[PDB]
Design an enzyme around this catalytic site. Structure first.
Site, short mmCIF file in Angstrom:
data_model
loop_
_atom_site.label_atom_id
_atom_site.label_comp_id
_atom_site.label_asym_id
_atom_site.label_seq_id
_atom_site.Cartn_x
_atom_site.Cartn_y
_atom_site.Cartn_z
N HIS A 20 65.62 55.87 60.60
CA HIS A 20 65.21 54.71 59.80
C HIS A 20 66.03 54.47 58.52
CE1 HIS A 20 61.96 51.75 59.02
NE2 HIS A 20 62.19 52.01 57.73
N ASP A 22 66.88 51.20 55.79
CA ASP A 22 66.52 49.82 55.41
C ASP A 22 67.60 48.99 54.76
OD1 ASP A 22 63.23 50.76 54.86
OD2 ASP A 22 63.80 48.94 56.05
N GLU A 123 59.64 47.12 61.85
CA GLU A 123 58.78 47.97 61.07
C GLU A 123 57.41 47.34 60.76
OE1 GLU A 123 60.32 49.80 57.56
OE2 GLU A 123 58.63 51.13 57.46
N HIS A 150 52.87 48.45 59.02
CA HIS A 150 53.59 48.85 57.80
C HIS A 150 52.54 49.42 56.88
CE1 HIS A 150 55.88 48.40 53.91
NE2 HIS A 150 56.61 49.25 54.61
N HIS A 191 53.92 55.43 59.10
CA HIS A 191 53.02 54.44 58.48
C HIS A 191 51.60 54.26 59.03
CE1 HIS A 191 55.56 52.53 55.36
NE2 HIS A 191 56.57 52.73 56.19
N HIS A 212 60.12 58.06 60.26
CA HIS A 212 60.30 58.57 58.87
C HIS A 212 58.94 59.07 58.35
CE1 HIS A 212 59.55 54.32 58.55
NE2 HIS A 212 59.46 54.34 57.23
N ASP A 320 64.92 57.21 55.36
CA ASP A 320 64.44 56.03 54.62
C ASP A 320 65.47 55.60 53.54
OD1 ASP A 320 62.45 53.93 54.26
OD2 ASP A 320 61.05 55.31 53.19
C1 B88 Z 1 60.38 48.97 51.82
C2 B88 Z 1 60.35 49.99 52.93
N1 B88 Z 1 60.54 49.21 54.14
P1 B88 Z 1 58.79 50.97 52.86
O1 B88 Z 1 57.64 50.37 52.03
O2 B88 Z 1 58.39 51.42 54.24
C3 B88 Z 1 59.25 52.40 51.80
C4 B88 Z 1 58.59 53.78 51.97
C5 B88 Z 1 57.77 54.26 50.78
C6 B88 Z 1 58.39 53.83 49.46
O3 B88 Z 1 59.60 54.11 49.20
O4 B88 Z 1 57.62 53.18 48.73
C7 B88 Z 1 57.84 54.10 53.24
O5 B88 Z 1 58.59 54.33 54.19
O6 B88 Z 1 56.58 54.24 53.27
ZN ZN Z 2 61.44 50.92 56.14
ZN ZN Z 3 58.66 52.75 55.97
#
Ligand code: B88
Ligand code: ZN
Ligand code: ZN
Length: 392
Positions: A20, A22, A123, A150, A191, A212, A320
């Site tokens: 994963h 982004d 996601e 999510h 998630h 992740h 991530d």
């Molecule tokens: C903006 C990303 N797509 P996310 O909110 O999934 C980020 C992280 C958590 C974070 O960095 O706040 C997660 O994988 O839970």
């Molecule tokens: Zn993500």
């Molecule tokens: Zn995420």
């Protein structure tokens, strides 16, 4: 040779498939997809966790590019299509470095060429707008996993970071898992709530992933995975891809974030409030109480434990990168992976353990989805069921 020299040599043979990243979201947000303003063929270290030279240095040979979109804004399908198009453009812009990958065979072909296999994962189940044909369209466009939620519940699945809702998956959520299996799309349980994790494991006749997620026994946070869920991975045949997010992996960071959110609430703000005023309260907290720092060691502790519980055949890595603002010392950006492998070497992980961790597990798992899909496509037609019919 040092353990880091060893780690690099190991990565040259069996590189990281990262679960994963982004970068497309970061490109959407930073530059509204102005790809020249964030060119990955040049050094993007001031702006981004990711560029191509750092991916090389990190020993990454495959990447699941996240096509994440916000569930709290309308037009999620349309935004998803734009995220997918962002991925296609990156591939088209960098054909010496990147190769589109739809299959576990594409992953291997990429490895033999020395190009980074570039796959996609959606996601959150909101990207399908409760529509099975839309799920089938994302697949047709190259989406190879979907995270069922999510950060919030959808109509048919509960998130780890929301209150209980349908209680895991609804009848239509099970139907979603069914069509994912028949299509060949990996069920991603990062998630989601533990109730959802368990319903999806019950329903799925294919290996599932966590793209992740780290370990809840090592660090109690609901974004992490309970041991009872890791224990079922071996029978299911899937894998958990450890993440680096310090506020998931370090107890002190978890406790700090909770105290910080409590302090936000004390001043009458929602913890996610991003107003200038909200931001002033937060800086005042961080002034009193410095943020703790996670390390490569913190991450290796999750992996040690998940390995004991889930087994070495059921692990991977999902950093991530570009999805989160903070990182562990030594895991600063996508060039960091050799530091983690060096640590694991120091802890007695074998070279075959490590190749399973970086490469072989993920390839096995995607292959297994394809296999399951072949059986289900020959057994029956696609579902035309609606959320109204199944959920009322
Ligand atoms: C903006 C990303 N797509 P996310 O909110 O999934 C980020 C992280 C958590 C974070 O960095 O706040 C997660 O994988 O839970
Ligand atoms: Zn993500
Ligand atoms: Zn995420």
């Amino acid at each position: 040779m040092t353990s880091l020299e060893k780690a690099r040599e190991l990565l040259r043979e069996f590189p990281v498939v990262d679960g994963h990243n982004d970068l497309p979201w970061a490109l959407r947000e930073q530059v509204r997809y102005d790809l020249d303003a964030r060119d990955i063929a040049a050094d993007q270290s001031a702006h981004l966790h990711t560029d191509l030279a750092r991916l090389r240095s990190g020993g990454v040979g495959a990447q699941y590019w996240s096509v994440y979109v916000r569930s709290d804004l309308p037009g999620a399908v349309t935004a998803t299509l734009e995220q997918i198009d962002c991925v296609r453009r990156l591939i088209d812009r960098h054909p010496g470095e990147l190769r589109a990958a739809l299959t576990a065979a594409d992953m291997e072909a990429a490895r033999a060429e020395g190009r980074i296999a570039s796959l996609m994962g959606a996601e959150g189940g909101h990207s399908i707008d409760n529509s099975l044909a839309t799920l089938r369209a994302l697949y047709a466009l190259g989406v190879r996993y979907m995270t069922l939620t999510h950060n919030d519940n959808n109509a048919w699945a509960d998130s780890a970071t929301d209150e209980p809702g349908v209680g895991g998956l609804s009848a239509f959520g099970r139907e979603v898992v069914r069509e994912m299996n028949r299509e060949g799309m990996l069920v991603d349980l990062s998630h989601v709530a533990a109730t959802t994790m368990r319903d999806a494991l019950d329903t799925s006749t294919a290996p599932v992933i966590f793209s992740h997620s780290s370990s809840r026994a090592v660090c109690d946070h609901p974004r992490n995975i309970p041991d009872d869920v890791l224990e079922r991975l071996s029978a299911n045949g899937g894998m958990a891809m450890v993440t680096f997010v310090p506020k998931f992996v370090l107890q002190a960071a978890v406790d700090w974030t909770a105290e910080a959110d409590d302090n936000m609430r004390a001043h009458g703000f929602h913890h996610l409030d991003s107003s200038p005023e909200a931001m002033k309260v937060h800086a005042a907290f961080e002034e009193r109480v410095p943020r703790p720092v996670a390390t490569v060691s913190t991450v290796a502790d999750h992996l040690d434990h998940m390995r004991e519980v889930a087994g070495v055949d059921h692990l991977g890595i999902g950093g991530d990168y570009d999805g989160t603002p903070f990182t562990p010392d030594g895991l600063g950006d996508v060039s960091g992976y050799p530091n983690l492998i060096a640590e694991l070497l120091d802890r007695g992980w074998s070279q075959s353990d490590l190749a399973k961790l970086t490469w072989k597990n993920a390839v096995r798992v995607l292959d297994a989805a394809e296999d399951v899909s072949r059986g289900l496509r020959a057994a029956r037609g696609p579902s035309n069921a609606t959320i109204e019919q199944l959920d009322g």
